[PDB]
Amino acid sequence: FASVYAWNRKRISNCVADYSVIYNFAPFFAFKCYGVSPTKLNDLCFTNV
């Protein structure tokens, strides 16, 4: 991926997504979650992520 000088911003929309594919990765270190608790990122609909 790119360095901090040029981030790769993406617009995720129109799809239906869950939290399992994010849990495919084990070495999670900076798992800090703000605003929304990690255990309940499911069953709630955003407007644009």
Place this chain on the structure above:
Amino acid sequence: YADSFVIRGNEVSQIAPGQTGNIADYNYKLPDDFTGCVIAWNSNKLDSKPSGNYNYLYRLFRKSKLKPFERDISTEIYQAGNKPCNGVAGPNCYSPLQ
């Protein structure tokens, strides 16, 4: 109520309540109110061994979360992925023990 354990200096700051860390994960949960205190001191001259203390273990990859003041001591069979690992399959075992 006094408890004792041995952790690295990196994880020492994780004993604070209301935070997520390597220790504060599934492995160990502590009450967030935390009326008590925490006492720690360096013991690199005793616990450390020239041969390498690989006998110290910790379960990072436990499936479910933990409730404060709950014991996590069991076989801890690893069953993840989109298939029944059954503990014998082989791949994706990544056992929590380290």
